[PDB]
Amino acid sequence: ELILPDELLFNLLDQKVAYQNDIIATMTNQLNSNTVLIKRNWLQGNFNY
Amino acid sequence: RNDVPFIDIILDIRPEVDPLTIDAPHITPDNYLYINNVLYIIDYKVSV
Amino acid sequence: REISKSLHDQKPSIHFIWGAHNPGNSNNATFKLILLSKSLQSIKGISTYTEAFKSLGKMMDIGDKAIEYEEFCMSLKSKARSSWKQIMNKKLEPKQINNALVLWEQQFMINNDLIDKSEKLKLFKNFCGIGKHKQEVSKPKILDFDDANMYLASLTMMEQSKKILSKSNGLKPDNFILNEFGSRIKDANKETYDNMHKIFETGYWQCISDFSTLMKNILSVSQYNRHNTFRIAMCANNNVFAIVFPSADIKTKKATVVYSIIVLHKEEENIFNPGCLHGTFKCMNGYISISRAIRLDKERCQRIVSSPGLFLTTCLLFKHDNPTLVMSDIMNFSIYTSLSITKSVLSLTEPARYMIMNSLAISSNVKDYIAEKFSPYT
Amino acid sequence: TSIWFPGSVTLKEYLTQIYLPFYFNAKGLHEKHHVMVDLAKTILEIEC
RNA sequence: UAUAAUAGUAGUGUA
RNA sequence: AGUACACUACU
RNA sequence: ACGAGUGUCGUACC
């Protein structure tokens, strides 16, 4: 699970206007949960060898 | 010198000692150096 | 993107305007301060902020009283530098000299008596951006890069910059790099020494050195800055000055510097304007030029201070071992790239690799890269 | 032919003119407020 | 026998 | 303000 | 004004 940064939620929750197609909110379940489940993307630089 | 027998070292350093001396070992030192009544057995090694 | 055709929608290429020094004026700090105050208060014509500039000149005026200004500054500096730790628990006391409330050397309070309230609000809200609005979808507005008129305007700006900045300073270079490493550079390569000497002889080096020194002086003065104090920053050039408007101290996070460049020149249209000139007004004895207010982060100021080294390295590296190149063109390109502290050139420097190398290659999908990835931000 | 200014260049000089401009950039020119959102957008787009 | 070693901080280049 | 691969500085 | 942006921001506040 990838945890979104606290400041990202801080400036996403204080917009006062809904975005047109919020990819972040769709995956975040309307900002209900900070974490997002990542399956096929092994993280950058972690599996170099 | 390369792979010089130890008996040859003894004979060169001590010509006065006769054959049938104490049996020199199977060791064939790469080189020998005699100075100040001291004999140095020198072996070359190329290894990490 | 939001494509703009208007020339007035341009953002500054270099956040600075430069004019040649005046040999007929003394380089003393007090004399330059007096001259700048008089020229600011002597501005003619009508404009939105011209009254504000004249009032600022009135605030920074010491009149015939000059000696006690030096005495005051020296007395404060002697006490300030006598202690390793910063002087605390003692409040700095303003001392009016004539029309100037001098708090520190080249630091003046906003004389609300001298300024009209409307003019002060215009200068602080609509010009310096201080206090604007309070605690609109649009798209990033960029200039039309393939427009014929926009490219013609850019070419004209570059030609004008090359015209103004290629003239010699009329003075022997005599700088640190030369006096200290000329023998080594000359013995390594004669041509490199000649190119470096030519760089030091032209107006590009003087302009960038003056801008670096002015930014260093601005950074030095801005630490003691208050909400009602505008500072004056000076460099070696006696015609280039900087107004440092009130802002937060540098030591705090996300601290920014607000400054405006002032250039005094004998004849109008004899200034290097890299798209950062607010207005050229007429004052006594010549023409004054005021640039638009510039707000910069501390990292951008650090790069600006370091910029002379970048400029020299870029010029010498591009001209190295190449007699077919004109040094003026290389210096013209380097002045702009060295002082580029915006992402507009960042969006162009990296894709150039892929585009040109795929063009030069045997098999490449350059069309796909240009269509789907190349995203200029001009 | 040279790229950024008139004149002729060697292939080594041509590659230098192609590749050096990348190093003219300044680190830390980004703003966190926007890059956070951009990186989140691209990650979540790929995941979706 | 082409294989045993690795203080802390900072900077730079690279993926 | 992370993973790895280095090089250079200071204690 | 300036910096950033096809994310509502920085821009000192009563």
Coordinates of C-alpha atoms in Angstrom, one line a residue, chain C:
Chain C
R1 CA -1.9 25.5 -23.0
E2 CA -3.2 29.0 -23.3
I3 CA -1.5 30.4 -26.3
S4 CA -0.9 34.2 -26.2
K5 CA -0.1 36.5 -29.1
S6 CA 0.5 39.7 -27.2
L7 CA 4.1 40.8 -26.7
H8 CA 3.2 42.3 -23.3
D9 CA 2.3 38.8 -21.9
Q10 CA 6.0 37.9 -21.9
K11 CA 7.8 36.9 -18.7
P12 CA 11.3 38.3 -18.0
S13 CA 14.1 36.4 -19.7
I14 CA 16.6 37.9 -17.2
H15 CA 15.2 39.5 -14.0
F16 CA 17.5 42.5 -14.4
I17 CA 18.1 45.6 -16.6
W18 CA 21.5 47.0 -17.0
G19 CA 23.0 50.3 -18.2
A20 CA 26.6 51.4 -18.7
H21 CA 28.4 53.2 -15.8
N22 CA 29.0 57.0 -15.9
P23 CA 32.6 58.0 -15.6
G24 CA 31.6 61.5 -14.7
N25 CA 30.1 60.6 -11.4
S26 CA 31.9 59.6 -8.2
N27 CA 31.4 56.1 -6.9
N28 CA 31.0 57.0 -3.3
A29 CA 28.0 55.5 -1.6
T30 CA 26.6 58.7 -0.3
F31 CA 27.0 60.6 -3.6
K32 CA 25.2 57.7 -5.5
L33 CA 22.4 57.7 -2.9
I34 CA 21.9 61.4 -3.2
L35 CA 21.9 61.2 -7.0
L36 CA 19.4 58.3 -7.0
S37 CA 17.1 60.2 -4.6
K38 CA 17.2 63.3 -6.7
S39 CA 16.6 61.4 -10.0
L40 CA 13.7 59.5 -8.5
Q41 CA 12.1 62.7 -7.2
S42 CA 12.8 64.5 -10.5
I43 CA 10.8 62.1 -12.7
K44 CA 8.6 63.9 -15.2
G45 CA 5.5 62.9 -17.1
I46 CA 2.3 61.1 -15.9
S47 CA 2.1 57.4 -15.1
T48 CA 0.4 55.0 -12.7
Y49 CA 3.4 54.8 -10.3
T50 CA 5.4 57.9 -11.2
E51 CA 4.1 59.7 -8.2
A52 CA 5.1 56.7 -6.0
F53 CA 8.6 56.8 -7.5
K54 CA 9.0 60.5 -6.9
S55 CA 7.7 60.1 -3.3
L56 CA 10.2 57.2 -2.8
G57 CA 12.9 59.6 -3.9
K58 CA 11.7 62.1 -1.4
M59 CA 11.8 59.5 1.3
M60 CA 15.4 58.5 0.4
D61 CA 16.5 62.2 0.3
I62 CA 19.1 63.5 2.8
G63 CA 19.6 66.9 1.2
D64 CA 22.6 68.9 2.0
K65 CA 22.9 67.0 5.2
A66 CA 25.5 64.2 4.4
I67 CA 28.2 64.1 7.1
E68 CA 26.0 63.0 10.0
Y69 CA 24.6 60.2 7.8
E70 CA 28.1 58.7 7.6
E71 CA 28.7 59.3 11.3
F72 CA 25.4 57.6 12.1
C73 CA 26.1 54.6 9.9
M74 CA 29.7 54.2 11.3
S75 CA 28.6 54.5 14.9
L76 CA 25.9 51.9 14.4
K77 CA 28.2 49.5 12.5
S78 CA 30.9 49.8 15.2
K79 CA 28.5 48.7 17.9
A80 CA 27.0 46.0 15.7
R81 CA 30.3 44.3 14.7
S82 CA 31.7 44.6 18.3
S83 CA 29.7 41.5 19.5
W84 CA 29.9 38.0 18.1
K85 CA 26.3 37.4 19.0
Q86 CA 23.5 39.4 17.4
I87 CA 22.6 42.5 19.3
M88 CA 19.3 41.7 21.1
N89 CA 16.9 43.3 23.6
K90 CA 17.9 46.7 22.2
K91 CA 15.6 48.4 19.7
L92 CA 16.9 50.2 16.6
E93 CA 15.8 53.9 16.7
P94 CA 15.1 55.8 13.5
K95 CA 17.0 59.1 13.0
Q96 CA 15.5 61.5 10.4
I97 CA 18.3 63.4 8.6
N98 CA 16.3 65.7 6.3
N99 CA 13.3 64.1 4.5
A100 CA 14.7 60.6 5.2
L101 CA 13.9 58.5 8.3
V102 CA 17.2 56.6 8.3
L103 CA 17.1 53.4 10.5
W104 CA 20.3 51.9 9.1
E105 CA 22.7 52.5 6.3
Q106 CA 20.6 52.7 3.2
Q107 CA 17.4 51.7 5.1
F108 CA 14.5 54.1 5.1
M109 CA 11.0 54.1 6.6
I110 CA 7.9 54.8 4.5
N111 CA 7.3 58.4 5.2
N112 CA 3.5 58.3 5.3
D113 CA 3.5 62.1 5.3
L114 CA 5.4 62.1 2.0
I115 CA 3.3 59.4 0.3
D116 CA -0.3 59.6 -0.6
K117 CA -2.3 56.7 0.8
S118 CA -3.6 55.8 -2.6
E119 CA -0.1 56.0 -4.2
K120 CA 1.3 53.8 -1.3
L121 CA -1.5 51.3 -1.8
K122 CA -0.8 51.2 -5.5
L123 CA 2.9 50.7 -5.0
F124 CA 2.5 47.9 -2.4
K125 CA -0.6 46.1 -3.6
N126 CA -0.6 46.4 -7.4
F127 CA 3.2 46.7 -8.0
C128 CA 5.1 44.8 -5.3
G129 CA 2.3 42.3 -4.7
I130 CA 2.5 42.8 -1.0
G131 CA -0.8 42.1 0.7
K132 CA -2.6 41.4 -2.5
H133 CA -6.0 39.7 -2.2
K134 CA -6.5 37.5 0.9
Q135 CA -5.9 34.1 2.4
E136 CA -9.9 31.3 -12.1
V137 CA -9.4 27.9 -13.6
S138 CA -7.4 29.0 -16.6
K139 CA -4.5 27.3 -18.3
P140 CA -0.8 28.0 -18.3
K141 CA -0.4 31.1 -20.5
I142 CA 2.6 30.7 -22.8
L143 CA 3.8 32.8 -25.8
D144 CA 3.0 31.5 -29.3
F145 CA 6.4 30.0 -30.1
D146 CA 5.6 29.2 -33.8
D147 CA 4.0 32.7 -34.4
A148 CA 6.0 34.7 -36.9
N149 CA 5.5 38.0 -34.9
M150 CA 6.5 36.4 -31.6
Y151 CA 9.7 35.0 -33.1
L152 CA 10.5 38.3 -34.8
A153 CA 10.1 40.0 -31.4
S154 CA 12.4 37.5 -29.7
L155 CA 15.0 38.0 -32.5
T156 CA 14.7 41.8 -32.2
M157 CA 15.3 41.5 -28.4
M158 CA 18.3 39.3 -28.9
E159 CA 19.7 41.7 -31.6
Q160 CA 19.2 44.7 -29.3
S161 CA 20.9 42.9 -26.4
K162 CA 23.8 42.0 -28.6
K163 CA 24.1 45.6 -29.8
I164 CA 24.1 47.1 -26.3
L165 CA 26.2 44.5 -24.5
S166 CA 28.9 44.0 -27.1
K167 CA 30.5 47.4 -26.5
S168 CA 33.6 47.6 -24.4
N169 CA 33.7 49.0 -20.9
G170 CA 36.6 51.3 -21.7
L171 CA 38.5 50.0 -18.7
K172 CA 41.3 47.5 -18.1
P173 CA 39.7 44.3 -16.8
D174 CA 42.0 43.7 -13.7
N175 CA 39.9 41.1 -11.9
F176 CA 40.6 38.3 -9.5
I177 CA 40.5 35.4 -12.1
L178 CA 42.8 37.2 -14.5
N179 CA 45.4 38.6 -12.1
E180 CA 45.6 35.2 -10.2
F181 CA 45.5 32.6 -13.0
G182 CA 46.4 34.4 -16.2
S183 CA 49.9 32.9 -16.3
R184 CA 48.5 29.4 -15.9
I185 CA 45.7 29.8 -18.4
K186 CA 48.0 31.5 -20.9
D187 CA 50.6 28.8 -20.7
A188 CA 48.0 26.1 -21.0
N189 CA 46.5 27.7 -24.1
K190 CA 47.1 31.2 -25.6
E191 CA 43.7 31.2 -27.3
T192 CA 41.9 30.5 -24.1
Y193 CA 43.6 33.5 -22.5
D194 CA 42.7 35.7 -25.4
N195 CA 39.1 34.6 -25.3
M196 CA 38.9 35.2 -21.5
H197 CA 40.4 38.7 -22.0
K198 CA 37.9 39.4 -24.7
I199 CA 35.1 38.3 -22.4
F200 CA 36.4 40.6 -19.7
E201 CA 36.7 43.5 -22.1
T202 CA 33.0 43.5 -23.3
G203 CA 29.8 44.6 -21.6
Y204 CA 28.5 41.1 -21.0
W205 CA 31.0 40.5 -18.2
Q206 CA 30.5 43.9 -16.7
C207 CA 26.7 43.4 -16.8
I208 CA 26.7 40.0 -15.2
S209 CA 29.3 40.9 -12.6
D210 CA 27.3 44.0 -11.6
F211 CA 24.1 41.9 -11.4
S212 CA 25.9 39.2 -9.2
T213 CA 27.3 41.9 -6.9
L214 CA 24.0 43.6 -6.7
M215 CA 22.2 40.4 -5.8
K216 CA 24.8 39.7 -3.2
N217 CA 24.3 43.1 -1.7
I218 CA 20.5 42.6 -1.8
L219 CA 20.9 39.3 0.1
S220 CA 23.2 41.0 2.6
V221 CA 20.8 43.9 3.3
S222 CA 17.5 42.0 3.2
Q223 CA 18.2 40.1 6.5
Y224 CA 17.6 43.4 8.5
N225 CA 14.4 44.3 6.8
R226 CA 11.0 45.3 8.3
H227 CA 7.4 45.7 7.1
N228 CA 7.9 49.5 6.7
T229 CA 11.5 49.7 5.4
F230 CA 12.7 49.8 1.8
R231 CA 16.4 49.2 1.3
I232 CA 18.8 50.6 -1.3
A233 CA 21.3 48.2 -2.8
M234 CA 24.3 49.3 -4.8
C235 CA 27.1 47.7 -6.9
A236 CA 30.3 48.7 -8.5
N237 CA 28.4 50.4 -11.3
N238 CA 27.3 53.9 -10.4
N239 CA 24.2 53.8 -12.5
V240 CA 22.6 50.5 -11.4
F241 CA 20.6 50.6 -8.2
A242 CA 18.1 48.2 -6.5
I243 CA 15.0 49.0 -4.4
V244 CA 14.5 46.1 -1.9
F245 CA 10.9 46.3 -0.8
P246 CA 9.7 45.0 2.6
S247 CA 9.6 41.2 3.0
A248 CA 10.2 38.5 5.6
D249 CA 13.7 37.8 6.8
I250 CA 15.8 35.2 4.9
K251 CA 16.4 32.8 7.7
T252 CA 12.8 31.6 7.7
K253 CA 11.5 28.9 5.3
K254 CA 10.2 29.9 1.9
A255 CA 11.7 33.3 2.3
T256 CA 11.6 35.5 -0.9
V257 CA 13.3 38.6 -2.0
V258 CA 11.4 41.5 -3.7
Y259 CA 13.6 43.9 -5.7
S260 CA 13.3 46.4 -8.5
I261 CA 16.2 47.6 -10.7
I262 CA 16.8 51.3 -11.5
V263 CA 19.1 52.4 -14.3
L264 CA 20.3 55.9 -15.0
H265 CA 21.4 56.6 -18.5
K266 CA 22.2 59.7 -20.5
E267 CA 20.2 58.9 -23.6
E268 CA 16.9 57.0 -23.9
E269 CA 16.8 53.6 -25.5
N270 CA 20.4 52.8 -24.5
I271 CA 19.5 50.1 -21.9
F272 CA 19.8 46.3 -22.0
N273 CA 16.1 45.2 -21.5
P274 CA 15.8 41.4 -21.4
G275 CA 12.0 41.6 -21.2
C276 CA 12.0 43.1 -17.6
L277 CA 11.5 46.8 -18.1
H278 CA 8.5 48.5 -16.4
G279 CA 9.1 52.0 -17.8
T280 CA 11.7 54.4 -19.1
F281 CA 10.9 57.9 -17.7
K282 CA 12.8 61.2 -18.2
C283 CA 14.5 62.8 -15.2
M284 CA 17.1 65.5 -14.8
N285 CA 20.3 65.2 -16.9
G286 CA 18.9 62.1 -18.6
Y287 CA 16.6 59.1 -18.5
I288 CA 15.7 56.8 -15.6
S289 CA 14.5 53.3 -16.1
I290 CA 12.5 51.3 -13.6
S291 CA 12.0 47.5 -13.9
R292 CA 9.0 45.5 -12.8
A293 CA 9.1 44.2 -9.3
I294 CA 10.8 40.8 -9.1
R295 CA 10.1 38.1 -6.4
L296 CA 12.8 35.4 -6.2
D297 CA 13.5 32.4 -3.9
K298 CA 16.8 32.2 -2.1
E299 CA 18.0 29.3 -4.4
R300 CA 17.4 31.5 -7.5
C301 CA 19.4 34.3 -5.8
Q302 CA 22.2 31.9 -5.0
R303 CA 22.4 30.8 -8.6
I304 CA 22.3 34.5 -9.7
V305 CA 25.2 35.2 -7.4
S306 CA 27.1 32.2 -8.8
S307 CA 26.2 33.1 -12.4
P308 CA 29.5 34.8 -13.5
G309 CA 31.3 31.5 -13.2
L310 CA 28.6 29.7 -15.2
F311 CA 28.7 32.4 -17.9
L312 CA 32.5 32.3 -18.1
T313 CA 32.6 28.5 -18.2
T314 CA 29.9 28.3 -20.9
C315 CA 31.5 30.9 -23.1
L316 CA 35.0 29.4 -22.9
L317 CA 33.7 25.8 -23.4
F318 CA 31.6 26.7 -26.5
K319 CA 34.4 28.8 -28.0
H320 CA 37.2 26.4 -27.1
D321 CA 39.3 25.4 -30.1
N322 CA 36.8 26.8 -32.7
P323 CA 37.9 29.8 -34.9
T324 CA 34.7 29.7 -37.0
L325 CA 32.5 31.0 -34.1
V326 CA 31.9 34.6 -33.3
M327 CA 32.4 35.2 -29.5
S328 CA 29.5 37.8 -29.5
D329 CA 26.9 35.1 -30.4
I330 CA 28.3 32.7 -27.8
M331 CA 28.2 35.4 -25.1
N332 CA 24.7 36.4 -26.2
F333 CA 23.5 32.8 -25.8
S334 CA 25.3 32.3 -22.5
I335 CA 24.1 35.5 -20.8
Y336 CA 20.5 34.3 -21.2
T337 CA 21.1 30.5 -20.3
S338 CA 23.4 31.3 -17.3
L339 CA 20.7 33.7 -15.7
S340 CA 17.8 31.4 -16.7
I341 CA 16.1 30.6 -13.3
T342 CA 12.8 29.6 -14.7
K343 CA 11.3 26.3 -16.0
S344 CA 10.7 27.7 -19.5
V345 CA 14.3 26.8 -20.5
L346 CA 14.1 23.6 -18.4
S347 CA 11.3 22.4 -20.7
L348 CA 13.7 22.9 -23.7
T349 CA 17.1 21.8 -22.5
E350 CA 16.3 18.1 -22.0
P351 CA 14.1 17.3 -25.0
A352 CA 16.8 18.8 -27.3
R353 CA 19.0 15.8 -26.7
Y354 CA 16.4 13.3 -27.8
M355 CA 15.1 15.4 -30.7
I356 CA 18.5 16.2 -32.3
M357 CA 20.1 12.8 -31.6
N358 CA 17.1 11.0 -33.1
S359 CA 17.3 13.3 -36.1
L360 CA 21.0 12.5 -36.5
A361 CA 20.5 8.8 -36.0
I362 CA 19.9 6.1 -38.6
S363 CA 16.6 4.6 -37.2
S364 CA 14.6 6.6 -34.8
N365 CA 10.9 7.5 -34.0
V366 CA 11.6 11.2 -33.8
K367 CA 8.1 11.9 -35.0
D368 CA 6.5 10.0 -32.1
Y369 CA 8.7 11.9 -29.6
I370 CA 7.9 15.3 -31.0
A371 CA 4.1 14.5 -31.2
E372 CA 3.6 12.9 -27.9
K373 CA 6.4 13.9 -25.5
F374 CA 8.0 17.2 -26.7
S375 CA 6.1 19.8 -24.7
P376 CA 7.7 23.3 -25.0
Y377 CA 6.9 25.8 -22.3
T378 CA 7.7 29.2 -23.7

